[PDB]
Structure 1
Amino acid sequence: SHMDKNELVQKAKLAEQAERYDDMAACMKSVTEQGAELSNEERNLLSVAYKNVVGARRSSWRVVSSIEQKTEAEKKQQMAREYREKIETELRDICNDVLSLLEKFLIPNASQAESKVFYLKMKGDYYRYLAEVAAGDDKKGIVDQSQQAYQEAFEISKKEMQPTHPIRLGLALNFSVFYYEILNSPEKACSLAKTAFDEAIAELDTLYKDSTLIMQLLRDNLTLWTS
């Protein structure tokens, strides 16, 4: 009556093909706000597009943040500092948009356990991104929001999913990286990774392509972290 969701979706797919991820995200944001549950396709369009869109700002944030530190020259360092801060603001606006879709529309309207974990994982992911750039006083509470989301995702997957399931494994991977990069807790990190790795291999005979990829990443991480 008031708007057209099927045409927004077509426009997201077309934005995708055109490699226009902001355009893309804005369609998927508008689609999520119509309030109906997202099919597996539309969920993926949402994820891919906010992944690309935030991922460019994170990538950029790093490059400019490293250049800021590698110049402990005063005036060129202030330029980099200000340019970093521009980048964080764009980053935060993105994270805030997604977290709102998550908490308001997506999580509460997820009917199956597979999707509830997918969205809670994503909740923790985007809180995590926010914690990568948090200033002192706000950092603690943002980190906690990340952790609680991942935890609540973690437990649902342990009860409701196979340990070889890619989403459970993606959750395990991202959750370990949280512990390692955010909390600076390598023992909890490696243990979470290994435990979730080991349990997957122990049913690697049941399955494949999707799960293996994550298992590889889990492994490369463990390797890097023990050093």
Structure 2
Amino acid sequence: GAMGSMERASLIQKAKLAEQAERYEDMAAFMKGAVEKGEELSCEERNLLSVAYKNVVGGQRAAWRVLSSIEQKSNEGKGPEVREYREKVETELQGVCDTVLGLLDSHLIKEAGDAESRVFYLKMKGDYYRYLAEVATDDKKRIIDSARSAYQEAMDISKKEMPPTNPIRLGLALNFSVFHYEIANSPEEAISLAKTTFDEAMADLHTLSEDSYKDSTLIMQLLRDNLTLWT
């Protein structure tokens, strides 16, 4: 529980209903319950897990950035309320990251043998350590290196086992490049990774169906957008 008494199929069905209703907290709770049934997740189910928690922590991060900005302005010679409330949101955010990292560690990653499932989960692990790094203040260094390590393992597998146009490989590369730029203070590594990823994908588009082409080029455009921003 609290999802322990519901059928796995019903949890998945309700996660999809929650997505339609834009009820992402519910969606995440349903997907947590589905994961905790102990069976591996399908491709579509992995996407549902990603969508649910990404939206939840997305709201929390946006709120945290608002409050952090206000707190920063408050400094530079009122009361403790701004800091308290930022800490409240921060704690809640960390709790969600810890929850997702918990699911990945118990036991999604260890049972994921196929390249695309394994890369998917390791990319997710990198992301949630990155979100923890965004608010960390030297616990921070170990957090950053945990993000790096997860991204790196995912990169190694994806380069060996997936085509350069694979959307999971592309999405991993885009986020690892964002990690380099935003977290690791390595803009040159960020730019290099983004460019090589984009160029290697470009060269492989000719192999793709119209639908696969659409999928890949969409993410390539986001890579390009970041490069334009960075240079």
Distance 1:187 1:101, change over 3 A: same
Equivalent in the alignment of 1:151: 152
1:219 to 184, 208, 224: 224
Alignment gaps of 5+ in structure 2 = none
Deviation, structure 1 residue 143? 0.5
Equivalent in the alignment of 2:126: 124
CA deviation profile, 1:33-59 (whole Å, cap 9, x unmatched): 111011122211111100111100011
CA deviation profile, 1:91-127 (whole Å, cap 9, x unmatched): 0010000001111121111131111001100000001
State the superposition RMSD in angstroms: 1.6
Deviation, structure 1 residue 220? 1.4
Deviation, structure 1 residue 74? 6.0
Matches of 1:15 and 1:173 in 2, distance apart?
Answer: 28
Matches of residues 50-69 of structure 1 in structure 2 within 5 Å? 50-69=53-72
Alignment gaps of 5+ in structure 1 = none
Matches of residues 185-224 of structure 1 in structure 2 within 5 Å? 185-207=186-208, 208-224=213-229
Deviation, structure 1 residue 73? 7.8
Equivalent in the alignment of 2:171: 170
- Asked if 1:184 is matched to 2:185, the reply is yes
Matches of 1:2 and 1:49 in 2, distance apart?
Answer: 21
Tell me the SS of whatever aligns to 2:168: helix
Structure 2 letter corresponding to 1:209: K
Matches of residues 4-153 of structure 1 in structure 2 within 5 Å? 4-72=7-75, 75=78, 78-135=80-137, 137-153=138-154
Deviation, structure 1 residue 187? 1.1
Matches of 1:64 and 1:74 in 2, distance apart?
Answer: 19
Tell me the SS of whatever aligns to 1:54: helix
Deviation, structure 1 residue 5? 1.2
Deviation, structure 1 residue 24? 1.1
Aligned pairs, number:
224
Comparing 54-63 and 38-47, the one that deviates more: 38-47
Matches of 1:20 and 1:210 in 2, distance apart?
Answer: 26
Distance 1:66 1:152, change over 3 A: same
Structure 1 letter corresponding to 2:92: E
Distance 1:159 1:11, change over 3 A: same
Deviation, structure 1 residue 3? 5.1
Deviation, structure 1 residue 154? 0.2
Comparing 110-119 and 151-160, the one that deviates more: 110-119
**TM-score, structure 2 length as denominator?**
0.92
Deviation, structure 1 residue 79? 2.5
Matches of 2:69 and 2:5 in 1, distance apart?
Answer: 47
Tell me the SS of whatever aligns to 1:37: coil
Distance 1:190 1:26, change over 3 A: same
- Aligned identity (percent) is 72
Structure 2 letter corresponding to 1:112: D
Deviation, structure 1 residue 29? 0.3
